[PDB]
């Protein structure tokens, strides 16, 4: 169906960099529109830093689709003031080597948040190797870049925030509030951790590595019975409280005696509103979370991924085949149990490692969803499945399946391990999709085709009538009577077109001209392409 899968645009980064680990749209609009791609293991022009990571800007509308790295940071690792003051000689406070910068990339307007969840530091008091998080926030198109490291604090070891790994997951709300997950706080209880770009800017005191973002929200420490839960392994945002301010969805994949759970935290406060819990022990429920209105009721519906889920075959053999759980929101609340569940078909395929909204991909009235299986397909390179929106929620079977056009190799591709959708790159009025594939150091861009709606009838004569959203003025059709065959241009604004002289069968002309954007129209579902008397 609607994504142009026969010739998508392929971006490629340095070999062995993990380019395509995280992906995003930047400045989606009439001008400046670009793709951002993270490369966690890339090399960087920073003094004494090995595999520090990178983020690549890949401008759209350039036909070779070239990519250039962004310097969020350009310094080496900082030094201990006591050491550079001492006859013993200098030592680092920081360990930027192998930090995984660009393992999370997010953008909102002209601002970009890029995070390094394997960053760690020597606390300035005593020798430690604490994997606190760090992120760099760019504001006003690289006019200013700010280090945000909210778990880097005086609470410095695994028992406090010292292992937090903040920016292991991240989001921006509709107003531009930064939201982070850090799965390692308080003996791996984990934490959600949120500030506005105005607070992050007002906090700026670069001489201090432990610093206050006054007014920041964060979830409290709980009793030791909650340890090893991993809260904030994944985060998403949607309006679930019924107020004006989006509410943070977060994944707890090891919580609840290793069954896993998902929590919705309210915006404005950070207090819990609803909880959903996993079907099976050590199925990774909350590996991925998403929120979008899939039935068009006006309310965000929750989606949750459990990639490791088992079932058994009708034969009786067990298999790892991941599951995605869907929970529609009603005006009374969200139900504590799934309204639909989708299951994978490939053993070890990991269906539900990735979720994204597509917006309304086919302009049908309902938001569609893409779901990834990083090890799916007949040669285990990976797959992406498009599931259609509709009045009952998602359809239970996909409207499209996306797969690599390149051949298999000595190591996995992880195609569909990262997804971003629901913005429009070429500006044709249909949403587009970016797929990450970091095992080959690639990312792939799939574009929504224009949709034509059509009708025709026999009147022994025959008549034709066709129109479509954002389609050109004249639409090319080809027609067969069963014999006579014809090719016609039908105007998109017409009432009808008709001919004087069984079955009538038609299609969009396969050799008709390519549109201004480089695409051809798709004929919509139903639309009765054949009539017989």
């Amino acid at each position: 169906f609607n994504l142009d899968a026969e010739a998508p645009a392929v971006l490629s980064g340095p070999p062995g960099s993990f380019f395509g680990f995280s992906v995003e749209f930047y400045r989606p609009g009439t001008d400046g529109v670009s793709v951002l791609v993270g490369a966690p293991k890339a090399n960087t022009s920073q003094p004494g830093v090995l595999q520090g990571g990178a983020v690549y800007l890949c401008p759209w509308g350039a036909s070779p689709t070239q990519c250039t790295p962004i310097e969020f940071d350009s310094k080496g690792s900082r030094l201990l003031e006591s050491s550079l003051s001492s006859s013993e000689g200098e030592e680092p406070v920081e360990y930027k080597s192998l930090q995984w910068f660009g393992a999370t990339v997010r953008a909102h307007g002209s601002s970009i948040l890029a995070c390094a969840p394997l960053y760690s530091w020597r606390t300035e008091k005593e020798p430690l190797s604490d994997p606190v998080g760090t992120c760099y926030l760019s504001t006003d198109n690289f006019t200013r870049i700010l280090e945000y490291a909210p778990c880097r604090s005086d609470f410095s070891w695994a028992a406090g925030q010292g292992y937090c790994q903040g920016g292991f997951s991240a989001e921006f709300t509709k107003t531009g509030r930064v939201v982070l997950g850090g799965p390692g706080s308080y003996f791996w209880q984990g934490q959600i951790l949120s500030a506005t770009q105005e607070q992050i800017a007002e906090s700026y005191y670069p001489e201090y590595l432990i610093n206050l973002v006054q007014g920041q929200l964060q979830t409290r420490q709980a009793s030791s019975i909650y340890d090893d839960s991993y809260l904030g392994y994944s985060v998403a945002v949607g309006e679930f409280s019924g107020d004006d301010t989006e509410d943070f969805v977060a994944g707890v994949p090891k919580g609840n005696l290793t069954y896993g759970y998902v929590t919705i935290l309210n915006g404005s406060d950070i207090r819990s509103l609803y909880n959903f819990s996993g079907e099976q022990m050590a199925s990774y429920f909350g590996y991925a979370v998403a929120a979008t209105d899939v039935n068009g009721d006006g309310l965000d519906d929750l989606l949750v991924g459990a990639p490791l889920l088992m079932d058994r075959t009708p034969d009786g053999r067990p298999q790892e085949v991941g599951r995605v759980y869907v929970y529609l929101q009603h005006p009374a609340g969200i139900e504590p149990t799934p309204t639909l569940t989708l299951t994978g078909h490939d053993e070890f395929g990991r269906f539900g490692s990735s979720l994204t909204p597509l917006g309304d991909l086919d302009q049908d009235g309902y938001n569609d969803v893409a779901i990834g299986a990083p090890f799916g397909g007949e040669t285990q390179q990976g797959v992406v499945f498009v599931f259609p929106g509709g009045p009952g929620g998602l359809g239970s079977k996909p409207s499209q399946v996306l797969q690599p056009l390149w051949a298999a190799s000595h190591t996995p591709d992880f195609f569909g391990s990262a997804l971003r959708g629901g913005r429009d790159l070429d500006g044709n009025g249909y949403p587009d999709l970016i797929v990450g594939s970091f095992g080959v150091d690639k990312a792939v861009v799939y574009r929504g085709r224009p949709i034509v709606s059509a009708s025709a009838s026999l009147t022994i004569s025959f008549c034709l009538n066709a129109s479509g959203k954002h389609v050109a003025d004249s639409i090319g059709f080809t027609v067969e009577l069963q014999t006579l065959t014809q090719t016609l241009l039908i105007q998109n604004g017409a009432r009808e077109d008709c001919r004087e002289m069984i079955a009538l069968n038609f299609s969009l002309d396969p050799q008709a001209p390519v549109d201004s954007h480089g695409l051809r129209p798709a004929l919509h579902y139903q639309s009765k392409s054949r009539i017989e008397d």
Partner: protein
């Protein structure tokens, strides 16, 4: 802007506990505050502690460990566990905000 509210006095017998309170503005109920001890005869203030919305605190480098802090919504507390003569002082609450700093009106701690 940020308003910090303190009671003018608190008291306890030598060897009993004291709790001071400082209340933040309801718009600013999640802000982190510093505590200062400053009543010693015409001497400059001394940083005691800072205290977070969640109750987490960190003490100054020389503080006797009798001092500890806790939080409840907009309220912030300093607890002194067993009052010595050297705990008899003014204690000032204080909060940084987007365009400056503000101090509470101070609480005197008295032996009885």
């Amino acid at each position: 802007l940020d308003v910090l509210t303190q009671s003018p006095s608190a008291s306890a017998s030598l060897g009993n506990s004291v709790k001071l309170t400082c209340t933040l503005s309801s718009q600013h109920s999640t802000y982190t505050i510093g505590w200062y001890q400053a009543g010693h005869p015409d001497k400059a203030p001394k940083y005691v502690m800072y205290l977070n919305s969640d109750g987490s605190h960190n003490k100054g480098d020389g503080l006797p460990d009798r001092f500890s802090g806790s939080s409840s919504g907009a309220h912030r507390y300093l607890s002194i566990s067993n009052i010595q003569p050297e705990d008899e002082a003014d204690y000032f609450c204080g909060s940084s905000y987007s365009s400056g700093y503000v101090f509470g009106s101070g609480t005197k701690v008295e032996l009885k």
